[PDB]
Amino acid sequence: MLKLLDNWDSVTSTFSKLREQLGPVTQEFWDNLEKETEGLRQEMSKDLEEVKAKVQPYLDDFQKKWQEEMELYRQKVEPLRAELQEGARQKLHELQEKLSPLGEEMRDRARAHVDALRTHLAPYSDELRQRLAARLEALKENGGARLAEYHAKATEHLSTLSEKAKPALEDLRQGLLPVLESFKVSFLSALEEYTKKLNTQ
Amino acid sequence: MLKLLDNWDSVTSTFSKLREQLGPVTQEFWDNLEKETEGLRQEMSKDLEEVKAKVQPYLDDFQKKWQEEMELYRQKVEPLRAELQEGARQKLHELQEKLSPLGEEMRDRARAHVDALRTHLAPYSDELRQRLAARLEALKENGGARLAEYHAKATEHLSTLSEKAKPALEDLRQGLLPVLESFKVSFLSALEEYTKKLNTQ
Amino acid sequence: MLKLLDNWDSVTSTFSKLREQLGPVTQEFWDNLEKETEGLRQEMSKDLEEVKAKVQPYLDDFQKKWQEEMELYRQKVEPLRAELQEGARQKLHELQEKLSPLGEEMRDRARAHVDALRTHLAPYSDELRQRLAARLEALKENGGARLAEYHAKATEHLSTLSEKAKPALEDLRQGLLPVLESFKVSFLSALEEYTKKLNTQ
Amino acid sequence: MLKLLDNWDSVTSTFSKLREQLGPVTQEFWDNLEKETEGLRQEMSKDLEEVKAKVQPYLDDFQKKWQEEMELYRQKVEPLRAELQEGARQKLHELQEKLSPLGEEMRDRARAHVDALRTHLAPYSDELRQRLAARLEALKENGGARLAEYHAKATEHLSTLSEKAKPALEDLRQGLLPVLESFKVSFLSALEEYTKKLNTQ
Numbered sequence: 001m002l003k004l005l006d007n008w009d010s011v012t013s014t015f016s017k018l019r020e021q022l023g024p025v026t027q028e029f030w031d032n033l034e035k036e037t038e039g040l041r042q043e044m045s046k047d048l049e050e051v052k053a054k055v056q057p058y059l060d061d062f063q064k065k066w067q068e069e070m071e072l073y074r075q076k077v078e079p080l081r082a083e084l085q086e087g088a089r090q091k092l093h094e095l096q097e098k099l100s101p102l103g104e105e106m107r108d109r110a111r112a113h114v115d116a117l118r119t120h121l122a123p124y125s126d127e128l129r130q131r132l133a134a135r136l137e138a139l140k141e142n143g144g145a146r147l148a149e150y151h152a153k154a155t156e157h158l159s160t161l162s163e164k165a166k167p168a169l170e171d172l173r174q175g176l177l178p179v180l181e182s183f184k185v186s187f188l189s190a191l192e193e194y195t196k197k198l199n200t201q
Numbered sequence: 202m203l204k205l206l207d208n209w210d211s212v213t214s215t216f217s218k219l220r221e222q223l224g225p226v227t228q229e230f231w232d233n234l235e236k237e238t239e240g241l242r243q244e245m246s247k248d249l250e251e252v253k254a255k256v257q258p259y260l261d262d263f264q265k266k267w268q269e270e271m272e273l274y275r276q277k278v279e280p281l282r283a284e285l286q287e288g289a290r291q292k293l294h295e296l297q298e299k300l301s302p303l304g305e306e307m308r309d310r311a312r313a314h315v316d317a318l319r320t321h322l323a324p325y326s327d328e329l330r331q332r333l334a335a336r337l338e339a340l341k342e343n344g345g346a347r348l349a350e351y352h353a354k355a356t357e358h359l360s361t362l363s364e365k366a367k368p369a370l371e372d373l374r375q376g377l378l379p380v381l382e383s384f385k386v387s388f389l390s391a392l393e394e395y396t397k398k399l400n401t402q
Numbered sequence: 403m404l405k406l407l408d409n410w411d412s413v414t415s416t417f418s419k420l421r422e423q424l425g426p427v428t429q430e431f432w433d434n435l436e437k438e439t440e441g442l443r444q445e446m447s448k449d450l451e452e453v454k455a456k457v458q459p460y461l462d463d464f465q466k467k468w469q470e471e472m473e474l475y476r477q478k479v480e481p482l483r484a485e486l487q488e489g490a491r492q493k494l495h496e497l498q499e500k501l502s503p504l505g506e507e508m509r510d511r512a513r514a515h516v517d518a519l520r521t522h523l524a525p526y527s528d529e530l531r532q533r534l535a536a537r538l539e540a541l542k543e544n545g546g547a548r549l550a551e552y553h554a555k556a557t558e559h560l561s562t563l564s565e566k567a568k569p570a571l572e573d574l575r576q577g578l579l580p581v582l583e584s585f586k587v588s589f590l591s592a593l594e595e596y597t598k599k600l601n602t603q
Numbered sequence: 604m605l606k607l608l609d610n611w612d613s614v615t616s617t618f619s620k621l622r623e624q625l626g627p628v629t630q631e632f633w634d635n636l637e638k639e640t641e642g643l644r645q646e647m648s649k650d651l652e653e654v655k656a657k658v659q660p661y662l663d664d665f666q667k668k669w670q671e672e673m674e675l676y677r678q679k680v681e682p683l684r685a686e687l688q689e690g691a692r693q694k695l696h697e698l699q700e701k702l703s704p705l706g707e708e709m710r711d712r713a714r715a716h717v718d719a720l721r722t723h724l725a726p727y728s729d730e731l732r733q734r735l736a737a738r739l740e741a742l743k744e745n746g747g748a749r750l751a752e753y754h755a756k757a758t759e760h761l762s763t764l765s766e767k768a769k770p771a772l773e774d775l776r777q778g779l780l781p782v783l784e785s786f787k788v789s790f791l792s793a794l795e796e797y798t799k800k801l802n803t804q
Binding site: 002004007010011014015018019022025026029033034037038040041044045048052059074081084085088089092095096099102106107110114115117118121124125128129132133136137139140143144147151154155158159161162165169172173176177179183185188191194195198 | 212
């Protein structure tokens, strides 16, 4: 029965080698690359430091320089602020006070229609209150049902043990009696299989 | 601030960057690698199935024959199955029945030792039996005790419900009730928000 | 052996066993717990959607109206949008154009400091520029070197293929070739295997 | 706009509490259980040890006792073995020698037909050999194509850097010049949004 089905043998030894064996690519390349790449990137980031270091304090100078111009402007402008600051507050202040007419207006006007619902509602509150509340009474009362149903079962369990522990306990106490075995002569067992085939074929 | 901060900008888009340009390593090389490799492999395997066809006829022509002859072999042998099978069954009882008696010899020869040790262990065998027995009763016994706890604690955690009920009801009432939505105007809201931002720094 | 080994048999089917009998804790209690709890919750929520219906009519009847009035509010206000919008645009240029000049004041007031520091950094700013420049050339330069390696190693790993070719071919020949399948019989095979087992211990 | 959608508030404060708050179950129960369960299971497994300890050597006695009976049987039976041992070898021995007729028979008979394929095959081996082999020549030759196509691209990459590094390098060197900003007066920006709404509504 020629096992030509080794078509794998044909492909594996041929194709697979070229691929798996061409793995030294990332080896010699990538690791050499990343080794020099980031490897010089580290020399540079550290080479740059000294630079940034030999300058920082100098540059620093400039920061205070910005701080200098800054305040001055923050100054000339400061006054214009109040002019607009309190300047606005006022017109807004007045407004709200000139907006209290809306009080007796809006309010006294709405008032009524608003209330409509107060009344169109009230019954429902009452309706639900009487409803949802009792719903929870069913919770406590029902909690007792399950608990009662539970405890009962818990108790029973502890009592079932008495009948269980007993039969199981005949196992070891007497197991030192029936350690009896099968003891197959051995060789004979060989004949057992032996003569069988004589007829199964 | 750190206008120099862009130093890392130049480190990254230079070193680690070219690396990504080499991803095509996996694009052109390994991709084209795998492409032809297994791709021709595909064109290869083809043959095995082809030839297979052109081969099968012969292989089969052959097959049908081999059997035709094998049968010659078989039939010219069977008689030995007898010459042998006979002698085999003979000794079978020589050992089934000459051995049978000794299989009892020990069958009982062991039994003694056992009945011996049986007695020999019984004390301990029982010291434990009755030991865990009463030790088991403790579990059941003290068990129910802590059981009562989970009942006693549940019965109380149950009654604590008629207490966390009432608040929600008020909350109920509340959520139902009207909403006299106060009214400003984006314009007003605008001023508020506005002047709010005019007194910052 | 260890006929007493069954001691652990009794420890396990007793202690850790009853525990599993209490899994129903999660079956009867928490299951029935969650069952009604969220189950009635389900019957509860129902109302909110119901009432909602009976409530919507009113809420809407109301809604349509509130607007009818709000509009009163709005329209009686708009004129202020003018009294205010006017005064607003006024000061707008007071600051757009009175401020505009100072925005340049610094616009250039800063520029100096800059042009200053510009010169102040240039040296370093360039010490680095030309530094990594030539330092970059090294990468390119020495890079191609190790590149040559992966080529040189590939060109050789390529020629090593015309070598692992020939064996498979012989293997080819082989796998093709006939099979003079030697013939025994299960019967014979039986004897072999048989007697094999007769000289063990 | 009455947010009655707090239907969660209604359910959460009610239903959720009873469940999450009934978690003390596994707390007081389970941990008390497993604490006593395995807690006494440990006292027992250790209580049992001493037992097994005060007996082992005793029991041990018995093991040698089995060892005693064992050998004796292993003895009486031992002889019957050879009778069957060499007793079988023989009939099997003869057989194979009386089975050599099958040699000149089976073989010289098959021989021919077998060969048929030797010849019905041979060409195909030759056919495939000439085929599959050249297939691999296409591998080496094609490996060179990709490699050549690759190296080329690798090289180009290292050369592209020269044109890239350059423009990017104007960034930091001069970035110490255009650190120019937006500088929004701030408060004015408030008017920017301010007067906008005046018309968007």
